[PDB]
Every structure is written in structure tokens, then in C-alpha cells.
Amino acid sequence: NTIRVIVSVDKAKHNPHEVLGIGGHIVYQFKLIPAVVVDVPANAVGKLKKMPGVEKVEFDHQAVLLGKPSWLGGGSTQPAQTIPWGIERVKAPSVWSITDGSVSVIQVAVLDTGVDYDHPDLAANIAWCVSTLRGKVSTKLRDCADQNGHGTHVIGTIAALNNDIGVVGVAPGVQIYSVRVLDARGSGSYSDIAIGIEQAILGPDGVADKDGDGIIAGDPDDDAAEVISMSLGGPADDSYLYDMIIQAYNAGIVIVAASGNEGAPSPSYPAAYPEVIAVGAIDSNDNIASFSNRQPEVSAPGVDILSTYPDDSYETLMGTAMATPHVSGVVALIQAAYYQKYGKILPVGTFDDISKNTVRGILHITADDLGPTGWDADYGYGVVRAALAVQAALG
Ligand SMILES: [Ca+2]
Ligand SMILES: [Ca+2]
Ligand SMILES: [Ca+2]
Ligand SMILES: [Ca+2]
Ligand SMILES: [Ca+2]
């Protein structure tokens, strides 16, 4: 029938009429990158490569969610609040006195199944919802709703309300943008994910850098997210997707993804990219989980993690998908605090960074170094600790 491809073009020379010429149908045109998602009869893909202004034609790959219910739970109750073990492990609670992440400029975007936006322990922190499914951007809530539970769970780990009920997130007051890039089954196309990343930048207004001041992540005038979190993976390294990642990085957004759960020598994509923080999983006894893909940047609680779940509910899940929000929360705490004290945010930084001058550099040196000294193939730099990190930030 047809297949979905993603074309990188020379925007000046590429004539879109040509794709319609070959029976192609345009799905979505990227704002931030020179690329377009198009459905073509596989008969035409060859024709596409040979067109002028077509630099590359890449295929629509797949990535998948990285968390699974620990006991095959369908979700359950917490009438009274409890603090999940990971939250303590990560030294979050001490921080709340300084900040809970409720500074206004700060948003955290989670690209995942969607969210249960009416969950009592979530709702007040849910700022914006979108779905990028099938290359259609929808802002209607019915589209936005979690049909899997993985995303609602990822989210509670980051933001869940500090209150009478349920559980509580690393950054319990931070603003959430739930960008749904995965289906009911937890499967996603690489193209929809790239669109999700773009949306996280564009923000609700649709305008990236509306002030045209060159500042986004950390500009109050702007609506951009300052932390994109992807508890998902796939094995493909595609050009266009990287490009979108660079776009986010360049906008100063901190990006975090799960290493993957295959006990692999190295992380899944996008975790594998240089500007993305790859997150490993540890357990309650501080062993690295056997499933956790190796060579992460850092690690965090990934085993038996209680969080929110749909229909106003809670559940325990496992995977590097679970580790990922913990890190994301830490960065949110860090940026929110830094921006509460000075009126800016820190640079994202690099993998080698070991200084207090970068968000990553801070994570790198405030982490609890385990196993072999220094960065290691199992723990990465170590286990992320919020309290130390913030201190480094404000120091
Ligand atoms: Ca923002
Ligand atoms: Ca709660
Ligand atoms: Ca701006
Ligand atoms: Ca501004
Ligand atoms: Ca180590």
C-alpha cells in the first residue's frame, strides 16, 4: 500500500509538488529541521532519492517503551501518601525546602504514552498535553490521554503531588508537558518522536523563540520546556532524528533517555547520542539491574518503582524507563533552583563535563560513584543525587 519515509531536503531547491507528482502524500513538515514526513508507494521511493533537493530518504523506524509492571499489576490504591524508595535514594526530599520545581519558566516534557491528566496526584502539575501520533499534532485531550499507563507512571515519578495521597515526585511542583508519542501498546515511530521533540520546543504557542531573542529554554517570555525525557528506545540511528535532537540541545534543553533493557553493551537510541543523557537502572540494594544496557552516563532507581497509574491509581514497574524520570527530576530541581536564585539556567553540558558549571557536569560529580572508581560501564558516573546537585548549583 504505502510506506512512511522522512525526507531531508534542501529547502530552497526541493519542490514539494514533485512528491505529489509521484503519488506521495505529505504528513507533516518540520519547522525546526529541513525535513518532511511523507507517505509513498514503495514503488516511488527510488524516484524520491533522485529528486533535486532530496538529500536523504530515511525510513520510519520503531522504538518502544522501557518499563513493565513488576508483578503484572493493573494498578491499585494508595489512600495515604508514601514516598517511593527511589525518591529517597535520589535525595530529593531534602531539596524541597529550597525548591520543589515550581518556578514558572520551567517545564518538563515527557514523551511517552500520554498521561492521565485527571489523576488527582498529577493534575495540578499538568500544564500542557499533546499527541503526535501518526504525524498529526493534536491538542484535543481525548487524543492526549494515556492508554497504556507507562506515561502516567513516568510522570508521577517526576512530578507527583506532595500531599495527602499517593506518591510524590522528584520535583513535586514542576510543570509538566505530556507529549504522547507512543500508542496504547507502547510502540512508537521514530518520526512521531521527532515531532514530539519539536513540539516540546515549539511549546503550546507554536512559537519557538517568539521574542526572537535567541533564548528559549529558560526564557520566561517563551513557553519552551527545559527538560525532555524519553523513557524509550529503538536500535536505529537515523539522521533526521539526530538533527531534531541537536535542535533541542541547541535550544538549551536538557535531554534524558533510558539506556535500554537488553543487557546490551551499549545504550539504545536516542540515549546513545552524545548530547543525550543515557540513564542506567539500579535496584534497592544498589546493584545495577542485569537488564540495564551498559555504558550509561548515569544511573538511578529502576526496579520495583511505585508511581501513578491511570484511572486514578498506582502501580509498580521496572525498567530503565523508570530510572529515567528520576534523573529528569533532578535536572528540573537543579534548573529551577538555579533560576530561582540567579535568573538564568545552566548550560546543558557534555558527557566529559566534570565541573559545576554545567547541568551534566554537576550530575557527573555529585553522583554516588559506585563499583569501580570513576565512570564505569555499569553505573555510568554514578547514582544521581538531588541534594548534592543543587548545592553544587548554587555554590
Ligand atoms: Ca520554559
Ligand atoms: Ca501525593
Ligand atoms: Ca526567546
Ligand atoms: Ca525573552
Ligand atoms: Ca564508578
Side-chain angles (χ1 to χ4, degrees), residues 211 213 219 221:
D211 22 14
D213 75 351
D219 183 334
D221 301 314

Side-chain angles (χ1 to χ4, degrees), residues 206-249:
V207 178
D209 182 0
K210 145 207 249 229
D211 22 14
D213 75 351
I215 304 175
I216 345 217
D219 183 334
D221 301 314
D222 283 303
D223 61 8
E226 283 81 14
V227 184
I228 288 173
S229 195
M230 303 184 283
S231 284
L232 76 250
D237 170 16
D238 293 340
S239 238
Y240 78 96
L241 182 70
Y242 187 50
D243 279 335
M244 186 67 49
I245 253 103
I246 297 277
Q247 244 23 60
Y249 181 81

Side-chain angles (χ1 to χ4, degrees), residues 128 139-140 171 180 213 240 247 284 295 351 356 377:
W128 188 44
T139 254
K140 302 169 99 145
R180 157 127 108 130
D213 75 351
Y240 78 96
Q247 244 23 60
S284 68
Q295 303 187 85
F351 182 83
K356 295 220 211 213

Side-chain angles (χ1 to χ4, degrees), residues 22 24 29 79 92 104 160 178 192 215 231 244 290 307-308 344 371:
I22 65 192
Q29 290 179 109
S104 284
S178 176
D192 286 4
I215 304 175
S231 284
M244 186 67 49
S290 44
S307 216
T308 23
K344 66 226 217 53

Side-chain angles (χ1 to χ4, degrees), residues 69-261:
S70 265
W71 313 300
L72 307 177
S76 85
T77 273
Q78 279 281 325
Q81 186 167 270
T82 323
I83 306 176
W85 77 256
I87 302 294
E88 275 150 352
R89 183 38 187 116
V90 95
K91 313 299 187 175
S94 85
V95 178
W96 301 336
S97 89
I98 304 158
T99 176
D100 68 357
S102 47
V103 343
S104 284
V105 54
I106 303 287
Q107 297 81 34
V108 161
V110 182
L111 294 38
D112 213 280
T113 57
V115 69
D116 181 355
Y117 51 73
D118 289 316
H119 192 122
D121 216 21
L122 281 199
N125 289 328
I126 308 284
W128 188 44
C129 290
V130 233
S131 164
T132 68
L133 294 185
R134 294 166 184 227
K136 145 115 132 17
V137 177
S138 172
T139 254
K140 302 169 99 145
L141 296 174
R142 54 133 201 247
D143 301 337
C144 287
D146 200 358
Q147 304 290 165
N148 178 291
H150 181 275
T152 289
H153 193 275
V154 187
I155 281 160
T157 291
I158 292 166
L161 292 163
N162 196 346
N163 48 71
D164 295 340
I165 61 165
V167 297
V168 51
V170 162
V174 77
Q175 282 172 75
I176 293 296
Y177 291 160
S178 176
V179 186
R180 157 127 108 130
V181 310
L182 303 177
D183 52 29
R185 299 255 218 105
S187 87
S189 52
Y190 267 41
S191 87
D192 286 4
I193 283 152
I195 298 161
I197 294 150
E198 164 147 299
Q199 295 303 296
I201 310 148
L202 288 184
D205 72 11
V207 178
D209 182 0
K210 145 207 249 229
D211 22 14
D213 75 351
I215 304 175
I216 345 217
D219 183 334
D221 301 314
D222 283 303
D223 61 8
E226 283 81 14
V227 184
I228 288 173
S229 195
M230 303 184 283
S231 284
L232 76 250
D237 170 16
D238 293 340
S239 238
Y240 78 96
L241 182 70
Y242 187 50
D243 279 335
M244 186 67 49
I245 253 103
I246 297 277
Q247 244 23 60
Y249 181 81
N250 278 335
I253 297 149
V254 177
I255 307 141
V256 197
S259 265
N261 301 349

